[PDB]
Amino acid sequence: MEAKAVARTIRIAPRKVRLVLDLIRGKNAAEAIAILKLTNKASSPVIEKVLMSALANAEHNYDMNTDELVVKEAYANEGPTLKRFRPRAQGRASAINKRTSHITIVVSDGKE
Amino acid sequence: PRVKGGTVTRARRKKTIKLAKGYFGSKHTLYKVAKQQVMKSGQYAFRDRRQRKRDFRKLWITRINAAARQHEMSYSRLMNGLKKAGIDINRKMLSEIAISDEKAFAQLVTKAKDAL
Amino acid sequence: AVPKRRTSKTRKNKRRTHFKISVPGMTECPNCGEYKLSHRVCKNCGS
Amino acid sequence: MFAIIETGGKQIKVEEGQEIFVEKLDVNEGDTFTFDKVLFVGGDSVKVGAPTVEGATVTATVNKQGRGKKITVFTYKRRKNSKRKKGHRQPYTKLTIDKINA
Amino acid sequence: MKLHELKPAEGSRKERNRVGRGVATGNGKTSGRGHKGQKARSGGGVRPG
Amino acid sequence: MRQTFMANESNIERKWYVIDAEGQTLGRLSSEVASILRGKNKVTYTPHVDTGDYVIVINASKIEFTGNKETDKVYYRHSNHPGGIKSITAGELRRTNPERLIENSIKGMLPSTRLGEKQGKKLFVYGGAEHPHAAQQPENYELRG
RNA sequence: GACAAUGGUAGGAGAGCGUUCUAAGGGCGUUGAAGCAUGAUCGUAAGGACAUGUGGAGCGCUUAGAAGUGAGAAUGCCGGUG
RNA sequence: UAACUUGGGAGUCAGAACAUGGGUGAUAAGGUCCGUGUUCGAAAGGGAAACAGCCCAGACCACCAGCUAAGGUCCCAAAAU
RNA sequence: ACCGAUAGUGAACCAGUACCGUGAGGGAAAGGUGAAAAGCACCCCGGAAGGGGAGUGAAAUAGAACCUGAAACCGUGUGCUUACAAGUAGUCAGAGCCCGUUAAUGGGUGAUGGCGUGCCUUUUGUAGAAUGAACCGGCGAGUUACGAUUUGAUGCAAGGUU
What we know:
The structure is cut from a larger assembly and holds chains A, B, C, D, E and F.
Chain A: E1 2-7, H1 14-17, H2 29-36, H3 44-60, E2 70-77, E3 82-87, E4 93-98, E5 102-108
Antiparallel strand pairs in A: 1-5, 2-5, 3-4
Chain B: H1 9-19, H2 31-48, H3 52-68, H4 75-85, H5 91-99, H6 102-114
Helix pairs in contact in B: 1-2, 3-5, 4-6, 5-6
Chain C: H1 9-15
Chain B binds three RNA strands through residues 1-10, 12-13, 15, 17, 22-27, 29-33, 35-37, 39-45, 47-62, 65, 74-77, 79, 88, 90-92.
PDB class: ribosome
Entry title: Staphylococcus aureus 70S after 50 minutes incubation at 37C
Organism of A: Staphylococcus aureus
């Protein structure tokens, strides 16, 4: 079957969370978890919590085997952006963008 | 009575955006650049619909020349002879015959060689 | 000192070809079940 | 065996059992048309006519009488505010070679 | 005479001319006013006579 | 689009030829070879595909010129460097490396396109009279002056 | 039917397409209207239809009438995203 | 096969090469000022390698038909080694 | 035959209010769940936020809640194609692969060949190294009231009209 878990409004730029999503795409649940505990990034800890939740849903709501699962899909969409200001040289003011992210993970066993 | 110009500009712009399908870059997205490309496309087709009648005629002549050079003769000499013989075959037909039934072409040359 | 023309999506995606992370060592443990870094302090301490 | 007929304003190399497209003719779908302008007759015997082979005809049957794909003609001036858009549909006629009475 | 099928006298009404509405109508950007000068300015023109 | 035969793959037949440059004008010989390479003497000639054959010059070191062309007719070449212009007379280019003298000459009468470069790779020039292509069984080809 | 004729800027003149509202007549709609998306469809052009998906209450046709009636450029104004 | 009269709307008042007849300049200028023509302006198409003003010629639309003009026919590249 | 949330008052909502200036003064942005809160009891992952089930409902429509397009922009997966090549990126010709429509001399990609210096404004002349536009989504320029003159239409006519 197929199980998924999403994390909305995640305070983290989508370009930085898309660098750790290209390391667990098409890997096994076991390997993926091990790779997320060795990666030195600020998104690994957040992504690891989402992957864990996705596995629990496939072992409870679908009661599937968690010893033969494989990460099928894994992407991150953009979310509401906050607008901020900070002073410059003279009386000018530059703009700051605090973008968010919508992490999503779909775990499956590879069987219709 | 006020008249809103909605659902009339998008419908006209969408038609031009669908006419530029298969372009490279943002030429199949942005309407501004798309329009310019479409306009140029139409100007090329019109001018390329008259150059296609000259390109194909240049091809036939080439083929005939090669096929007419296998019987110790030149295109200019063959063409001249055929006209004096009274034949009215087209250049596209003359080439087609030579490519396929080569035996038939041989006879034609003989007739043109008899008219000197 | 300022861009003469804006960069396209093609050229921008071509410059980000070597911009990525690399998978680490991740040495297997003899008695713990979980993985660990090579030449580290744990239950594996490398292999 | 093949023959070279001259219909409309050009020449076509047809053969027994073959579909061809010519200019709008004056007939009705399901009728029989016969060409009397034969310039060449290939196959076993070779008959090369002078202006045209005397005593040569080709019969065929009309199949359809529709129009071609719509062509959009569009031209314009560089800076001069002037342009023109136009459509076109060249009418045609589909026939099927029957016999080649040499 | 039926209110759902009225008909005005043949050739007794015409549509007004609108300038500055495309280049296919004939009166484009210049709207038949030439190029520059004092007769091309808004509210321009010398006093009659 | 009525009916016009168009050559393509699995329909083109390329053969091998052996031309002799024994007492032949450089330009006069090159011109003839060029046409053969492009395949303009074939009845099924097509411009968007290669239908030419392979040519093989045997002699090439016995090529002759006309007038004082061996003393003049210098061959210049730049190396994309300030003041990097080198030259060499045709007569001095015939004594050493005479195969390049014919190659360039025949390569200058071909179109400068992708097909033009691929059509120029079907030419083999030598200096002696023995070619290592006996497995292709190439036949002699008389120059139609 | 002949017979000629048909390049175009400033500018003359003629014939039309579409948009919002009103009148009269005849119609459509929870068995799914307008809008939105997709399509290999029709007209000489501006344009017009059908079918399918989303949508959940209004909307077009015929002949007239009245206009805040058509957008690619003004270092145009405002928002959004590069 | 045009012309004239009367009336309704106009735009134009910075022109440019080329070939002739002249002034000015130095029988200098892609100079400048007149007169007689043609083309560009507002004209695509072929030739002059590329080249608004040179030469040939004015595009209602379609066709994988034919005859010519200037200029051309060894290869690039249509046609005489 | 007025407007329908960039419209109509500056103000449909927290308007002369946030804010800005020593002061006189200047002056915004912002409407919409459903017929009825019946506003997600309960279980699972998690510190929480957020999610997956299960439930109420005609339909999650779930409290950044009618519809939700783009010029946009940012992604994930796939059918064809690409690492010897000089490019206003298109147009005509055209193999090879892959599909199957409003069914018609079909559709998608495209190895190779020929031809080809964007658009507007201003100029005798602009590919111009002259001007303007980052991406147009919305708004944004011959109008009305009185007179005058000429043309078309209708009514009556030595009378015509208030």
